[PDB]
Amino acid sequence: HPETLVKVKDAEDQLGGRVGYIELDLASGKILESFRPEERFPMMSTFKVLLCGAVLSRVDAGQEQLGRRIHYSQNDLVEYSPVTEKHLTDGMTVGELCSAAITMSDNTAANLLLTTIGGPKELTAFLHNMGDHVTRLDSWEPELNEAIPNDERDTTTPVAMATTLRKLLTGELLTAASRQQLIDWMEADKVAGPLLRSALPAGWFIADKSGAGERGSRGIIAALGPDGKPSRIVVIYMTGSQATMDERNRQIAEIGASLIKHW
Ligand SMILES: *[B]([O])([O])[C]([C]C1=[C]C(C([O])=O)=[C][C]=[C]1)[N]C(=O)[C]([N])C1=[C][C]=[C][C]=[C]1
Ligand SMILES: [Ca+2]
Secondary structure (H helix, E strand, O other), rough: OOOOHHHHHHHHHHHHOEEEEEEEEEEOOOEEEEEEOOOEEEEHHHHHHHHHHHHHHHHHHOOOOOOOOOOHHHHHOOOOOOOOOOOOOOOOEEEEEEEHHHHHHOOHHHHHHHHHHOOOHHHHHHHOOOOOOOOOOOOOOHHHOOOOOOOOOOOOOOEHHHHHHHHHHOOOOOOOOHHHHHHHHOOOOOOOOOOHHHHHHOOHHHHHHHEEEEOOOOEEEEEOOOOOOEEEEEEEEEEOOOOOOOHHHHHHHHHHHHHHHHO
């Protein structure tokens, strides 16, 4: 496997569109390497981690409980809701909704959680308020996956997302319990098998969240490291090609193989 930045540029060569990449040291926050760090990419389902950050912040502020059961109708269901579609009678707790949104990419679960915080506008305010003046959520699922227009809506940058993820996971913004719950959900991710996880050696820790959108869009955010503990943050986004799902998966896995090999 080639050097990581070479592999990233190669992925872009093969896919077309743009590929963005950043690797951060978790302990220090220092940027180790990057490519297109400050360019915008659609967040796609990766936003669901930030959403649950906002939910946990409200729990920490005594405004929400993870045990609170939410009921909803079949009319609330949108595409890609593999968990929520199974609980129309019994409903789901806020904590269960976050697990579904993060670990299964459940869209209705995300929408229901957005409602609890006051919508995409309030998620953006939450981000602005913790120091992220770049990332913006403008739409609900499943419209936010349009990857254009309109036009910088529903976007982040690799460095914005990486910095914000780091603050959520290790900063004093959330309580220790809440930081732990957020990473626990990400560690339990069920649908990112073919991505960074495919290149992960035995004994390593990974907590991640993937996403997919229109116009060749794919992405992953991760905290990972050897010896069962995370030590670096990795964010990879891609958009603006006609690449099939399999090919986009392959390039991300190959970037992963590279950054592990050249750790
Ligand atoms: B999303 O990325 O905001 C959402 C759900 C989804 C997540 C993942 C993943 O890897 O986490 C993947 C596939 C879908 N995306 C969509 O709702 C989008 N319309 C979509 C749905 C199916 C396949 C591609 C895109
Ligand atoms: Ca290029």
